[PDB]
Amino acid sequence: QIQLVQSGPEVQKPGETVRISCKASGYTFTTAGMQWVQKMPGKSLKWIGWINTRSGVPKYAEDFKGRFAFSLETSASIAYLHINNLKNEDTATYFCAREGPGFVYWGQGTLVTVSSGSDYEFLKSWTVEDLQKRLLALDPMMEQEIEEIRQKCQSKRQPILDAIEA
Amino acid sequence: QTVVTQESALTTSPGETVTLTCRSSTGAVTTSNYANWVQEKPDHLFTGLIVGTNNRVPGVPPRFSGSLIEDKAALTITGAQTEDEAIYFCALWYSNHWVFGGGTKLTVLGGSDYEFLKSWTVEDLQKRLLALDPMCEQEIEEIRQKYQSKRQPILDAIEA
Amino acid sequence: GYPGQV
């Protein structure tokens, strides 16, 4: 059983750096290349490049070369994607996928969210009381979204139980 | 400039054959484009189906097959199942880079009542049941990170 | 052929 397991969702500010991990198992790591793929929300997939896991040499797509870089920790069967100087448009789900030719086995995806730099530049002038009100008003919205996921989950679970028990 | 084009959406019925196609802006798709087909299901769960035009990835059901038909790459699902409802992407190799198509949303009619599950084996139902909780936890953790991102500039303003 | 590592 071949599995690629990526690090969990990550949040960073514009201008910061993120590292996405991809741990491979079930095959000899250095015998197949590792691709990296970007999927910005609601948009299609873009190939970032590959890394040859035997030679350690990367090959980049022209639009990603520069701020996107690949490295390895071969002894651990890990491939890394490094994104530096993060920009708003980098918010996306990133995937590793093993060769090949192309994209045979896929990691689960890592959602990288780049926070709003512009918001700090108007909020910096607010009082702590108005900032705290803003901060706390996000919590009911988050709690409502989570409660909705839990309900949809229950609605997917029940027909499976019904089928097991039929 | 190089564009890979797929049908945006199509619908079949369970048990029928359906074909999805993948067109290149450079002309005919050939074996030199090493056409791939991959499937996306919630929550951003990608499976590889076909690589190198017609090579089915181990463990994919044999009802999935890849070919070239006229000047396009094609994925044929011979006997589509209700759980094949998903988004299918093709990718083509153009000398020095991969380009993905925009994806085809395949609808398979009839599963809203979940009656199809009553025909499955116990082992396959148990596997589907056990996969649900981790998928739901992943979705919740992504909500939590969406809100950590929204909180970040506020916290920075508090901490300035 | 395909130049990736397969």
CATH of A124-166, one of 3.30.56.10, 2.60.40.420, 4.10.170.10, 3.40.309.10: 4.10.170.10
CA distances from C6 to B25, B57, B85, C2 (A): 26, 13, 30, 9
SS3 A163: helix
Q: How far apart are CA B142 and CA B152, in angstroms?
A: 15
In this complex, is the C-beta atom of A70 within 8 Å of any C-beta atom belonging to chain C? no
Q: How far is C5 from chain B (nearest CA, A)?
A: 13
Determine the topology of domain B1-112 in CATH: Immunoglobulin-like (2.60.40)
Cβ contacts of C2 on chain B, cutoff 8 Å: 34, 52, 93
Q: Give the resolution to one decimal, in Å.
A: 1.3
Instruction: Give domain limits for chain B.
Output: 1-112
Instruction: Give domain limits for chain A.
Output: 1-123, 124-166
Q: Token pair 């192309």 is at which residue?
A: A102
Report DSSP state, residue A9.
Answer: P
Cβ contacts of A100 on chain C, cutoff 8 Å: 2, 4-6
Burial class (CB in 10 A: 0-12, 13-18, 19+), A42: exposed
Question: Across B29-101, where does the E strand assignment appear?
Answer: 36-41, 45-51, 55-56, 64-69, 72-78, 86-93, 98-100
Return the H-helix or E-strand segment holding B20. Answer: strand B17-24
Among residues B73, B2, B81, the alpha carbon closest in space to that of B38 is found at: B73
